[PDB]
Amino acid sequence: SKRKRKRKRKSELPQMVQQLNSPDQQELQSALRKLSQIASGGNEQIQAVIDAGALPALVQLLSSPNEQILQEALWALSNIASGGNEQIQAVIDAGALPALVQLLSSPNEQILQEALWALSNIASGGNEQIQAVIDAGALPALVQLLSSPNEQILQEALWALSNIASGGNEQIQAVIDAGALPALVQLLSSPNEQILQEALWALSNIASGGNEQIQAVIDAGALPALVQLLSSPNEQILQEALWALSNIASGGNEQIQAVIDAGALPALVQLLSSPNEQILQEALWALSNIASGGNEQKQAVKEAGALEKLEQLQSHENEKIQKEAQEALEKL
């Protein structure tokens, strides 16, 4: 009866590849601009760039001392990695990952941003593609960028970590093992709404894993902060706070109890009186997961005043809320 949620975020062509070897800098940079423009479009267009064999040339252009070339080579591969799971694999096979991981140590803010956006597109594929990013050694660098004073780099590192944490339990464990949780818990107190929202996204995906992955979040100290975000006037921060707690509540009775002990129930029951259907639906989802525990957890929910409001919510105009309230009462 427990629900878990994850969220991910994303012509003479064979001669154009040879044009990258041209001594004329206007010629090699024009071809590189065209190649990147084709890959920005649909999946079929990206596949044509693969067939022309641009990937080994683009991967070699990742060591170019020319910043204008490197910038466009990164933007082209980023567009190539925005495609399908198989197209992303082609970028990995080309040897992009060791070069991109080394590009994370670049003191060039433009290049660093361009590389993070490429790694985030590779991490938005399948679990085979995410594990490739992990095995490349991207995680120690991404966790280090969580302490960066550059708000843009910090946001783009969070983008990559949320995508890595959107994979399997082995992938989420890797993010935990890399030491991401203390840094993410620190970002929950941040006055920057953009940074807080990205850290809420990453933690919610870590919380979507197994009981052990959920416990890591609890031991990290995320709950007091998370319960306080349930009092936020910001609808975006609130939806993400409810998203993280629902995934923590989808764990075991020991995890569900930690949620109760953190003072979530008075806040969750209050959110049931919201005229905002999205907030009410997520508050319901979070309660439905708590009600999926033992008698000790069910008693806490009953004593919080949930029964009264859940009974009243069976008459709601929204059929999705009518259903959610009937499910939660049955559990109780």
Can you give the binding site for Mg ion, defined by CB under 5 A? 67, 110
Token look-up 């957890």 returns 297
If one asks whether residue 233 binds Ca ion (CB under 5 A), the answer comes out as: no
Nearer to Ca ion, 13 or 195 (CB): 195
Nearer to Mg ion, 71 or 232 (CB): 71
Environment class of 129 (CB within 10 Å of its CB; exposed 0-12, middle 13-18, buried 19+)? buried
How many of the chain's residues bind Ca ion (CB under 5 A)? 4
Site for Ca ion in 173-232 (CB under 5 A): 191
| Dihedral in degrees, nearest 10, Cα atoms 74, 78, 80, 82 | 180
Compute the distance between CA of residue 253 and CA of residue 256 in angstroms, rounded to an integer: 5
Least CB distance from residue 68 to Mg ion, whole Å?
A: 8
Least CB distance from residue 6 to Mg ion, whole Å?
A: 35
DSSP string, 80-138: HTTS-HHHHHHHHHTTHHHHHHHGGG-S-HHHHHHHHHHHHHHTTS-HHHHHHHHHTTH
233 makes contact, choosing from Ca ion, Mg ion, none, with CB < 5 to 8 Å by partner type, with none
Least CB distance from residue 153 to Ca ion, whole Å?
A: 9
Compute the distance between CA of residue 264 and CA of residue 322 in angstroms, rounded to an integer: 22
- Yes or no: say if 29 and 68 are a contact pair by the CB < 8 Å rule: yes
Least CB distance from residue 248 to Ca ion, whole Å?
A: 25
65 makes contact, choosing from Ca ion, Mg ion, none, with CB < 5 to 8 Å by partner type, with Ca ion
Nearer to Ca ion, 46 or 145 (CB): 145
Nearer to Ca ion, 279 or 291 (CB): 279
Nearer to Ca ion, 71 or 211 (CB): 71
- The conformation of residue 23, written as its DSSP 8-state character, comes to S
The pair of three-digit structure tokens given for residue 66, joined into one six-digit string = 């020319």
110 makes contact, choosing from Mg ion, Ca ion, none, with CB < 5 to 8 Å by partner type, with Mg ion
| Contacts with 224 (C-beta within 8 Å, 6 or more apart), sequence order | 262
Candidate segments 25-33, 111-119, 230-238, 272-280, binder of Ca ion by CB under 5 A: 272-280
Nearer to Mg ion, 67 or 330 (CB): 67
15 makes contact, choosing from Mg ion, Ca ion, none, with CB < 5 to 8 Å by partner type, with none
Least CB distance from residue 107 to Ca ion, whole Å?
A: 13
**Cα dist from 275 to 203, 234, 268, 271, 281, whole Å:** 27, 15, 14, 9, 11
- The conformation of residue 40, written as its DSSP 8-state character, comes to T
Q: Which amino acid is at 10?
A: K
Compute the distance between CA of residue 69 and CA of residue 56 in angstroms, rounded to an integer: 15
Site for Ca ion in 47-66 (CB under 5 A): 65
- Interface map 274-303 toward Ca ion (x if CB under 5 A): -x----------------------------
Chain interruptions in the chain, by residue before each (C–N > 2.5 Å): 10
Nearer to Ca ion, 172 or 325 (CB): 325
149 makes contact, choosing from Ca ion, Mg ion, none, with CB < 5 to 8 Å by partner type, with Ca ion
- Interface map 135-154 toward Ca ion (x if CB under 5 A): --------------x-----
191 makes contact, choosing from Mg ion, Ca ion, none, with CB < 5 to 8 Å by partner type, with Ca ion
Least CB distance from residue 146 to Mg ion, whole Å?
A: 23
| Contacts with 159 (C-beta within 8 Å, 6 or more apart), sequence order | 9, 116, 117, 120, 198
Point out which residues bind Ca ion (CB under 5 A).
65, 149, 191, 275
